[PDB]
């Protein structure tokens, strides 16, 4: 009964939409960083306030917001085929 509500409260976190993957290409200023979507449009957005650009660097796999498209979270390395070979 309580664990079911925990999965309900789990679902209370899931209405938040997932962000968009991104690759930081390069940067311009502290509010402007060259980034491109996987489908090819290039953007310049602002970051979140926790990060330093030493945590980003140019040519970095990252994520952006779904509206403001702001730099928020990230992971350096991913791919499908590797481990499955």
């Amino acid at each position: 009964t309580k664990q079911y509500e925990k999965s309900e409260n789990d679902l209370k976190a899931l209405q938040s939409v997932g962000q968009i993957v991104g690759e930081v290409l390069k940067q311009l200023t502290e509010e402007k960083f060259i980034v491109k979507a996987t489908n090819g449009p290039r953007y310049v957005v602002g970051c979140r306030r926790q990060l330093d650009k030493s945590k980003l660097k140019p040519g970095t796999r990252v994520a952006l917001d779904m509206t403001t498209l702001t730099i928020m979270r990230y992971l350096p390395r991913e791919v499908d085929p590797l481990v499955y070979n």
């Binding site: 209405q15 939409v17 779904m66 509206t67």
Partner: protein, 287 residues
């Protein structure tokens, strides 16, 4: 039957719940409901605005929850003023806030139940500060195809509402729909205090703190930005002394000026902050 120029009297609390319910759903479009009272045909007022919960069916006529309406109106009955419902509204944060096919699919239901049921749309994106933004919509009666489609009389608020003419795709809805005017009623005391509430940004937080925080820093570490300003002095004015000689070569103005004007005059206005607030030290230190 009888049609006359319409005016929507809005309360600041209504507009607040409008943009608040629309900002929390961005990008996703949300669905609210308009609350108020119908005084007559040519005037209408919205005295309250409440938000409907978001469901899986999305924005649809079925998204309105009847047990939510029964319990809300009951919660409005224990609230001071339990006014009757009037119309619906839905935000459109992601685009130019035009009515879709589902918006009219719920409009024949809201015009069925309620006589008027004015549809309002609001978006945060268009302007960050100085525009009403929002939107207005009302469904014209398709049963009026017999008679003419062009009222009203006292065209004052009408001809002034049409302008800008609102693009094309929006006024593409001017066929089968028409907008409605919105004015802000006072309620001047609350409008004045809430005016100063946002004025706390550019004036000061308490009207005391933030420029006493300008007495905290007060040239501190504000000369560092004066060193960067005097670096803007050297930078901008070393290419500003190249301008008047070139003006003598090309004979004369290339229109132009480079602008490359004003600027550090504002730095000297911070020097007025220097002289004033430091002259306060004679008052601070002595007694």
């Amino acid at each position: 039957a009888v049609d006359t120029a319409e005016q929507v009297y809005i309360s600041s609390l209504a507009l607040l719940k409008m943009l608040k319910h629309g900002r929390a759903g961005v990008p996703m479009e949300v669905m609210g409901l308009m609350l108020g009272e119908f005084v007559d045909d040519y005037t209408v007022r919205v005295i309250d605005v409440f938000a409907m919960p978001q469901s899986g069916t999305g924005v649809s006529v079925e998204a309105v929850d009847p047990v939510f309406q029964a319990k809300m109106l009951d919660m409005l009955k224990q609230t001071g003023r339990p006014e009757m419902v009037v119309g619906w509204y839905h935000s459109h944060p992601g685009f130019g806030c035009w009515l879709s096919g589902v918006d009219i699919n719920t409009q024949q239901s809201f015009e069925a139940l309620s006589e008027r049921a004015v549809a309002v749309v609001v978006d945060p994106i268009q302007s960050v500060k100085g525009k009403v933004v929002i939107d207005a919509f009302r469904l014209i009666n398709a049963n009026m195809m017999v008679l003419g489609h062009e009222p009203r009389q006292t065209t004052s608020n009408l001809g002034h509402l049409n302008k800008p003419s609102i693009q094309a795709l929006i006024h593409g809805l001017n066929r089968h729909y028409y907008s409605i005017t919105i004015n802000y009623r006072k309620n001047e005391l609350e409008q004045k205090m809430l005016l100063n509430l946002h004025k706390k940004s550019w004036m000061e937080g308490l009207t005391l703190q933030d420029y006493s925080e300008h007495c905290k820093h007060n040239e501190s570490v504000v000369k560092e930005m004066l060193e960067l300003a005097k670096n803007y002095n050297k930078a901008v004015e070393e290419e500003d002394k190249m301008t008047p000689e070139q003006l003598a070569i090309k004979n004369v103005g290339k229109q132009d000026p480079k602008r490359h004007l004003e600027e550090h005059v504002d730095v000297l206005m911070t020097s007025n902050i220097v002289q004033c607030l430091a002259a306060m030290l004679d008052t601070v230190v002595f007694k």
